[PDB]
Amino acid sequence: MLPNMRSALKMFEQSVLLKSVETIRVDFVDDIIITATPIRAVVQVADKKKLNLDSLDWSKQYIWVHSGSKMEIGQFIEWHGKDFKLVAAGDDYSDYGYNAWYGEETLKPVLVSS
Amino acid sequence: SQSIINVARYIRDLLDYDENLIQFDRKNTQQSDTVTGYIVVNGSGVQNVLSHGSSYDGDAEIMEYSKSESRLITLEFYGSDAYENAELFSLLNQSQKAKEVSRGLGLTIYNVSQATDVKQLLGYQYGNRVHVDFNIQYCPSVYVETLRVDASEFEILVD
């Protein structure tokens, strides 16, 4: 019997939107439909969000979510005001009943429907 | 020896600028209060020699070993008024005031060659820092008590 952290994930839940992009192109012109779903999750900070140095300073908040629902990389997660690309340090205890990912705020505005 | 301190003197009273606000170089000195525009005479550039003179004096009889050389000393201006203290220096360097105050500083002064606003990574912040370049040429000397020759006795021979 595979251990299932699922029940150990409900208490800490939070509502959040999980979107994915399925890019569409004709004659090499970019359009992006969206797929958004209300999914369960839990959020903690992932890399303490610092200020990098460049020609202009920039900063991207990091969150790392858990959920009972599967989360592929090429998906975004919005919880407060800015979606996070599910890019890094993710791991799928799918057979153990959940999965986790870090998150990168896409400083672009949130993909509502396009 | 004294050359860097001399160019520090020259920049001290060309800009009419403070003692305690000119620190030398890659020594140990804290740059507190970033806005306090400092000036540092970076001497890290290699000084290369040009000639090694040797003069000799007759009556008060000693001699004089000299060594002309030059070094690309750079100037780093800090502080909120770095830019000005760069430009206003980079432009008064060749005026009356400079060329008239560097009287006894045994140190020529060449034109400012180039400038740069390369700042310093002050830990998630950027503090104003500007470098200006100019070759400086001087010649240290030392005096040694040798002694002259008053005559020369000698003998010859022939077949």
- Residue carrying the six token digits 């251990």: A3
CA-closest candidate to residue B34, choices B94, B72, B78 = B78
CA distance B124 to chain A (A): 7
Nearest-CA neighbor of A64 among A81, A82, A39, A87? A87
SS3 A10: helix
Which residues of B fall within a CB distance of 8 Å from A50? Answer: 124
User: Three-class SS of residue B143?
Assistant: strand
Contact A51 B121 (CB under 8 A): no
Q: Which residues of B touch A (CB under 8 A)?
A: 121, 124, 126
CA-wise closest residue to B56 among B152, B151, B143:
B143
What residues of chain B lie within 8 A of the CB of A48, using their CB? Answer: none
Q: What is the resolution of the experimental data for this entry, in Å?
A: 3.6
How crowded is residue B84: how many other Cβ atoms within 10 Å of its Cβ? Answer: 14
Minimal CA–CA distance to B115: which of B145, B80, B85? Answer: B85
10 Å CB burial of residue B55 (0-12, 13-18, 19+) is exposed
Q: Which of A48, A50, A53 should be substituted to probe chain B, the one whose Cβ sees the most B Cβ atoms within 10 Å?
A: A53
Please tell me which residue of chain B has the smallest CA distance to A50: B124
B31 vs A74, B25, B28, CA distance in Å? 47, 12, 10
Q: Are A70 and A99 a contacting pair, CB within 8 Å?
A: yes
A59: closest chain B residue by CA: B124
- State how far the Cα of B77 lies from the Cα of B131, in Å rounded to an integer: 7
Say if residue B29 is exposed, middle or buried (CB neighbours under 10 Å; 0-12, 13-18, 19+). Answer: exposed
User: Would you say A103 and A63 are in contact if contact means Cβ atoms under 8 Å apart?
Assistant: yes
The token pair that represents B69 in the structure block: 């050389």
Yes or no: say if B21 and B37 are a contact pair by the CB < 8 Å rule. Answer: yes
